[PDB]
Design a protein around this ligand. Structure first.
Ligand SMILES: Nc1ncnc2c1ncn2[C@@H]1O[C@H](COP(=O)(O)OP(=O)(O)O)[C@@H](O)[C@H]1O
Lengths: 223, 842
C-alpha cells in the first residue's frame, strides 16, 4: 500500500542521513555536503504524489531544508581560525561537549543551529580578528628573521651601511602597527608576543638611531 | 574590416555548408557586433540596423530577409559544439543556470540577468573566442563592467588576472607583471583574461607599451638576456609538450607570440586624454546606464524576499507609470517596483535640472539604486520585526489581563467587593483600549511599506543636497506614492522615524548641533551600506564623529599625510574605526575597501590593498571627510560612497533662525511642535514601557491584587496618560495649523537673518580683512534675541517681533562696521537697507 511505501522511503532517508552523519567533521567537505543535500532534496521531491502527502515526508522535508540552511554555518565552522580555543568557547557557551579529535558531523548536526547562531557568529568574528593579528605577527617574524643591512664599500677601507631611510620606515611602521594592535579588541592572548616584539623593535630603533649619527660623524671626521 | 573577416572566418570554419541565408545572417551579426555596439544613441543603432538590412537587400537581392534576418541574432557554441545560431530563450535560461552556479563557487553577491546583461555576456563570449580578442567596455562606472567580464571569463574557463593598484606604482613592476602574464599565456598555454580600470590606466606609459601587444600580440624589447633565455627554455618545453619539433630560438619566439595571440585577451573598462590608437586597436562595446526595464527587473528580484502584498490594493486610474511594460492590472509589488524606478528617474531629472541651473551636481549610478534597494530591504525587515514583536507582546498582555480578570472574579466570588468591581471596570477599559491599539497596529501594518520606501529613498539617494532640495525630492516621492495609492502616513518625521529619543540625546551629548539637517546627517551616518563621505567646511561633523566612536579608538588621518597608507593598514588589520580627511586629493588604493572586495582563503578573510593582501578585520569602518565644499569627484568615487553634507545654505539657516525665534518668543507653540513630533513614536514607546511595568507589577499576584486594592492607581495613571496622547491625536491637525500660522508670522525675520548672514560672508570680496564666521552671526543673533534690553517690559508678540527686526539690523551693522573700514560703512548700510526693503511688505 501507500503507507508501507512511504515508511520504506522514510527508512531510506534515515539511512542516508545516518550515512551523512557518520562521516567525521574533519573529513566532510561543505561543497560535497551541499551536493549530497541537493541530491537528498531531489530524492524527496521525485517521490510520487501519494508519498508526498504524509506527515513524515513533511518532517524530513523541512528537516533537510534546515540542513541546507545551516550548511552555510557548516562552511564558516570549517576554517583554520578556530584551532582549539574558539571551539572550547563554543562548547562552554553551548554547554555541549564536542572534542574536535572525536568530533563527527553528526554531533554538530544534532544541535540546533537555528537558535545558537549568535554565539557562532560572535566567536567567528573573534577568531577572524585573532587570526588576522596572528598572521601579522607571523609576517613580522618572517620579515625580521631575514632582513639584513645593505652594505657598500667606502674608499676601499670598510663596508658602511646604505639604506638608513628604508629600515627606519620599516621599524617605525612595525612599531606603530604593534601599538595600534595594543588597542585592538582581539588583543588578549597575543600580549606576550607583542611586548617581546615591541621590546625588540625599540632596541633596533634606538640602536640604529645612534648608529646613523655615529656613522655620519665618523665619515665627516675621516674626510 | 580585418576583425570582421576574422570573425566571419572563425564562425565559418568548423561548419560544413550553409545556404546564402546563413552567410548573410552571420555577416550581419558580425557587422552588428563591430559597429552597432560602439554606438551610444539608440536611434543610431536603429539607423545601423535598417542600413545593414538595406545593404543586404541591395548587394544580395532575391534572398529571404525573414529566415536569414531576425531582431534577435545571437550566436554561441554553449548549446552545441559549433558556433551556430541559437534561440534567445534557451540562451537566457542557460545563462540563468550558470549565474546560479557562479554564485556558489565564487564571490557570492546577488546578480540579475536582463536583456542588456545577456547581450553583454554574449559579446564578451564572442571577443573571448576570437584570436587576439581585445575589448574596451566603456560606460558609466559601477554598472557591471568588472562583474560581467569576470563572470564571462569564469564561464569560458579563463584565469582572470588584474593589475593591483598601489601608491607610487613603479613601471618596472608593470613590466614584470607583463612578463609573468606573457610567460603564463604563451608558454604554459593558459587562457588569461586581462582586465584594467581607470584606477590603473592613469599612466600613459603603460598604454603606449601595451599598444604594441594589442596590435602585434607581442612586446619587443621586453624579453632580453637572462629573461630571454629562460623564456626560451620554457617555450621549448611547451613546444615539446604540445608536440612540436621546433627548437630554433627565433621561430620559438614566433610560436610564443602566436600562442599569446590565441590565448591572451585584454579587457578595458573606462568612463566617457585617451589616444585613439587604444580605441582602434581593440573592440568597443558601449555599456551605458541601466535601462528602465533593467531597473524594474532589479527591483522585482531584490524585493522578492519581502512581503509587499496587499490583496485589497485598489488599482489607481491614470497610473503615472514610468516602466512601459507594467502588467495590467498592476499588483502592489509591481507598483512598489515602479515607484522605485520613478525615484531613480527623479534623481536623474533633478541632477539634470541642477546641471542646467549651473549648480554643482554629482552623478547617480546603478550602484546607488542597488544601495537604495538594500536599505529598503534592511529597513523593511527591521520595522516589520519590531512591529510584529509589539503585536505579540500586546497579545500576550491581553491573555494575561484576561486571566487576571478571571482571577479577580474568583476573588469576588469569595466594601472591598465594590472596589474589586471598580478594578474590574478599569481592567475592561484597559482591554478595549488595547483592542483599539491592535486596530491602529493593523493600520501601521498597512502603512509600513510606503513609510519604509520613502525613508529608504531619503537615506540612500539624498544626502548631498541641501535642505530645500531634500524637501523637494521627498515631496515629489510622497506625491507619486499618493498618486499610486500607496499607504504612507501623510506626515513623516524622518528624523523621528529613523531614530528615537536616546540616539538623538547621545548625539546632543556629542558635539552635534540640534539642527534638523544635522540630525538627518547623523541618521545617514548611522544607517549606511557605503562608507560616508562627510562634507563640511566648519568641522563640527568631524569632531562629532570623533566623539561618537571615541570608545572604539577612532583615529584621524589625511591623504596628505605620508603615513596614511600605514594607518589604513593598521586600522584595516585591527578593525578600529578610521577617519580620513582631505578626500579631494584622493588615492585610488581605497577603492577595494569601499567596494568591499574580500576573499575567503581558509580561515582568513583578506583584501587586496595596494600590492599586499591585508587581513580584513570584522569590525573595520572608514569615514571619508573633506572641508572644501566646492570640489568635484570622479563618478567612481561617487559610486563608492554615500554623501553626507553639512554645508549651511539659505534654507537650512532660515529654518534654524525660525526654530530659534519659535523657542525664544513662543515657547508654548514650540512645545506644541515638540509634542507633535513626539506623538509619532516617542509617546507610544513611553506608554508601552509603562504598560510593561504595569504588567510586571500585575504578575506578582498572591491575592495582593485585592489586599488593599491600591495598585489600580497606576492603572488609572496609565489610562490617564493614554487619554492624554489620545487627545493629542484629536487636535494634531489643530496644532498643525496653529504652528503653521505662527511660523508664517515669523518667517520674514528668518529670511532677513539668512540674507544678512550671506551678505556678511560675501563681504570678503571687498577687502581681505572682512572675514566673518557663522558663529559670529549666531552670537549677534543670540544677543538680539536674549540679552537685548529693548525687549524688557513688553509682551505684545508683534511689537517684540518688530523690535527684534530693527535691532537685528542695528546690532549687525554696528558689530560689522566696527571691524570694517570707514569707506565701506555706506556700502554695508546700503546692502542692509536693500535686504530690509526686499523683506518688508507693502
Ligand atoms: N547585472 C547585475 N546585477 C546586479 N548587480 C550588479 C550587476 N552588475 C554589477 N552589479 C553590482 O555592482 C557591484 C560591483 O561594481 P561593478 O558593477 O563591477 O563596477 P564597474 O562598473 O566598475 O564594473 C557589485 O556589488 C554588484 O552587486
Amino acid at each position: 500500500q501507500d503507507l508501507k511505501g512511504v515508511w520504506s522511503e522514510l527508512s531510506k532517508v534515515w539511512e542516508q542521513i545516518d550515512q551523512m552523519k557518520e562521516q567525521p567533521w574533519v573529513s566532510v567537505q561543505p561543497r560535497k555536503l551541499r551536493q549530497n543535500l541537493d541530491a537528498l532534496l531531489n530524492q524527496l521531491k521525485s517521490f510520487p504524489a501519494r508519498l508526498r502527502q504524509y506527515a513524515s515526508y513533511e518532517f524530513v522535508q523541512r528537516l533537510l531544508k534546515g540542513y541546507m540552511k545551516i550548511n552555510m554555518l557548516v562552511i564558516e565552522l570549517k576554517s583554520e581560525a578556530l584551532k582549539d580555543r574558539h571551539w572550547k568557547q563554543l562548547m562552554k557557551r553551548l554547554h555541549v561537549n564536542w572534542v574536535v579529535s572525536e568530533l563527527t558531523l553528526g554531533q554538530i548536526w544534532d544541535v540546533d543551529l537555528q537558535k545558537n547562531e549568535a554565539i557562532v557568529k560572535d566567536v567567528l568574528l573573534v577568531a577572524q580578528g585573532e587570526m588576522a593579528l596572528e598572521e601579522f605577527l607571523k609576517q613580522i617574524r618572517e620579515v625580521w628573521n631575514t632582513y639584513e643591512l645593505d652594505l657598500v664599500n667606502y674608499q676601499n677601507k670598510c663596508r658602511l651601511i646604505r639604506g638608513w631611510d628604508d629600515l627606519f620606515n620599516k621599524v617605525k611602521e612595525h612599531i606603530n602597527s604593534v601599538s595600534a594592535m595594543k588597542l585592538s579588541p582581539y588583543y588578549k592572548v597575543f600580549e606576550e608576543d607583542a611586548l617581546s616584539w615591541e621590546d625588540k623593535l625599540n632596541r633596533i630603533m634606538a640602536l640604529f638611531d645612534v648608529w646613523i649619527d655615529v656613522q655620519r660623524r665618523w665619515v665627516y671626521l675621516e674626510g | 574590416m580585418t576583425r570582421w573577416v576574422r570573425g566571419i572566418f572563425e564562425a565559418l570554419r568548423p561548419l560544413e555548408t550553409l545556404p546564402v541565408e546563413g552567410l548573410i545572417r552571420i555577416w550581419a551579426h558580425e557587422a552588428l557586433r563591430l559597429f552597432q555596439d560602439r554606438l551610444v544613441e539608440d536611434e543610431e543603432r536603429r539607423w545601423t540596423d535598417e542600413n545593414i538590412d538595406t545593404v543586404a537587400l541591395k548587394h544580395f537581392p532575391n534572398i529571404d530577409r525573414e529566415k536569414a534576418m531576425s531582431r534577435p541574432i545571437l550566436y554561441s557554441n554553449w548549446l552545441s559544439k559549433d558556433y551556430i545560431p541559437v534561440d534567445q530563450e534557451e540562451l537566457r535560461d542557460y545563462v540563468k543556470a550558470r549565474l546560479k552556479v557562479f554564485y556558489e563557487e565564487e564571490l557570492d553577491v546577488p546578480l540579475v540577468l536582463f536583456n542588456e546583461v545577456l547581450d553583454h555576456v554574449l559579446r564578451i563570449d564572442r571577443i573571448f573566442r576570437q584570436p587576439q580578442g581585445h575589448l574596451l567596455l566603456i560606460g558609466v562606472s559601477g554598472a557591471g563592467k568588472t562583474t560581467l567580464s569576470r563572470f564571462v571569463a569564469w564561464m569560458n574557463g579563463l584565469s582572470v588576472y588584474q593589475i593591483k593598484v598601489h601608491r607610487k606604482y613603479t613601471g618596472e613592476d608593470f613590466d614584470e607583471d607583463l612578463r609573468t602574464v606573457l610567460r603564463r599565456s604563451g608558454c604554459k598555454n593558459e587562457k588569461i583574461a586581462f582586465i584594467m580600470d581607470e584606477s590603473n590606466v592613469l599612466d600613459s606609459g603603460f598604454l603606449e607599451r601595451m599598444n604594441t601587444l594589442l596590435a602585434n600580440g607581442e612586446v619587443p624589447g621586453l624579453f632580453e638576456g637572462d629573461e630571454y633565455a629562460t623564456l626560451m627554455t620554457q617555450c621549448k618545453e611547451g613546444a615539446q609538450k604540445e608536440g612540436l619539433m621546433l627548437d630554433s630560438h627565433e621561430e620559438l619566439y614566433k610560436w610564443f607570440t602566436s600562442q599569446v595571440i590565441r590565448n591572451l585577451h585584454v579587457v578595458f573598462t573606462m568612463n566617457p586624454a585617451t589616444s585613439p590608437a587604444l580605441f582602434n586597436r581593440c573592440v568597443l562595446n558601449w555599456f551605458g546606464d541601466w535601462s528602465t526595464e533593467a531597473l524594474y527587473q532589479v527591483g522585482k528580484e531584490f524585493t522578492s524576499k519581502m512581503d509587499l502584498e496587499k490583496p485589497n490594493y485598489i488599482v489607481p486610474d491614470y497610473m503615472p507609470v514610468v516602466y512601459d511594460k507594467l502588467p495590467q492590472p498592476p499588483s502592489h509589488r509591481e507598483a512598489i517596483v515602479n515607484s522605485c524606478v520613478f525615484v531613480h528617474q527623479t534623481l536623474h531629472q533633478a541632477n539634470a535640472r541642477l546641471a542646467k541651473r549651473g549648480g554643482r551636481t554629482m552623478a547617480i549610478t546603478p550602484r546607488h539604486y542597488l544601495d537604495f534597494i538594500n536599505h529598503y530591504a534592511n529597513l523593511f525587515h527591521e520595522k516589520r520585526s519590531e512591529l510584529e514583536e509589539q503585536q505579540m507582546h500586546l497579545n500576550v498582555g491581553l491573555r494575561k489581563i484576561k486571566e487576571t480578570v478571571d482571577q479577580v472574579e474568583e476573588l469576588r466570588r469569595d466594601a472591598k467587593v465594590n472596589r474589586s468591581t471598580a478594578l474590574l471596570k478599569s481592567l475592561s477599559a484597559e482591554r478595549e483600549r488595547w483592542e483599539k491599539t491592535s486596530e491602529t497596529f493593523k493600520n501601521q501594518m498597512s502603512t509600513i511599506a510606503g513609510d519604509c520606501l520613502l525613508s529608504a529613498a531619503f537615506i540612500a539617494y539624498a544626502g548631498y543636497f541641501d535642505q530645500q532640495m531634500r524637501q523637494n525630492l521627498f515631496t515629489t516621492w510622497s506625491h507619486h506614492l499618493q498618486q499610486a495609492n500607496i499607504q504612507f502616513r501623510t506626515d513623516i518625521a524622518r528624523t523621528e522615524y529613523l531614530s528615537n529619543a536616546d540616539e538623538r540625546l547621545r548625539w546632543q551629548a556629542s558635539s552635534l548641533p540640534a539642527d534638523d539637517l544635522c540630525t538627518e546627517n547623523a541618521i545617514m551616518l548611522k544607517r549606511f551600506n557605503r562608507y560616508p563621505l562627510i562634507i563640511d567646511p566648519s568641522g563640527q561633523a568631524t569632531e562629532f564623529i570623533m566623539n561618537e566612536y571615541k570608545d572604539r579608538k577612532i583615529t584621524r588621518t589625511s591623504f596628505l599625510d605620508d603615513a596614511f597608507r600605514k594607518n589604513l593598514e593598521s586600522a584595516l588589520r585591527f578593525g578600529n574605526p578610521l577617519l580620513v580627511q582631505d578626500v579631494e586629493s584622493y588615492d585610488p588604493v581605497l577603492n577595494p575597501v569601499l567596494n568591499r572586495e574580500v576573499r575567503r582563503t581558509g580561515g582568513r578573510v583578506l583584501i587586496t590593498l595596494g600590492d599586499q593582501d591585508i587581513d580584513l578585520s570584522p569590525s573595520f569602518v572608514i569615514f571619508l571627510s573633506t572641508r572644501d565644499p566646492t570640489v568635484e569627484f570622479p563618478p567612481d568615487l561617487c559610486s563608492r560612497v554615500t554623501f553626507v553634507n553639512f554645508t549651511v545654505t539659505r534654507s537650512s539657516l532660515q529654518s534654524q533662525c525660525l526654530n530659534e525665534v519659535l523657542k525664544a518668543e513662543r515657547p508654548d507653540v514650540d512645545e506644541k511642535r515638540s509634542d507633535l513630533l513626539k506623538l509619532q513614536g516617542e509617546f507610544q514607546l513611553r506608554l508601552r514601557q509603562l504598560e510593561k511595568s504595569l504588567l510586571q507589577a500585575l504578575n506578582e499576584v498572591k491575592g495582593r491584587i485585592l489586599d488593599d486594592d491600591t495598585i489600580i492607581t497606576t492603572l488609572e495613571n496609565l489610562k490617564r496618560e493614554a487619554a492624554e496622547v489620545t487627545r493629542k491625536v484629536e487636535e494634531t491637525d489643530i496644532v498643525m495649523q496653529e504652528v503653521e500660522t505662527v511660523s508664517q508670522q515669523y518667517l520674514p525675520l528668518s529670511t532677513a537673518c539668512s540674507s544678512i548672514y550671506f551678505t556678511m560672508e560675501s563681504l570678503k570680496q571687498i577687502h581681505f580683512l572682512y572675514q566673518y564666521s557663522l558663529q559670529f552671526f549666531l552670537d549677534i543673533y543670540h544677543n538680539v534675541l536674549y540679552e537685548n534690553p529693548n525687549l524688557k517690559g513688553v509682551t505684545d508678540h508683534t511689537q517684540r517681533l518688530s523690535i527684534i527686526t530693527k535691532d537685528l539690523f542695528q546690532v549687525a551693522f554696528n558689530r560689522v562696521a566696527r571691524g570694517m573700514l570707514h569707506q565701506d560703512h555706506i556700502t554695508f548700510a546700503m546692502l542692509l537697507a536693500r535686504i530690509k526693503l526686499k523683506g518688508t511688505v507693502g
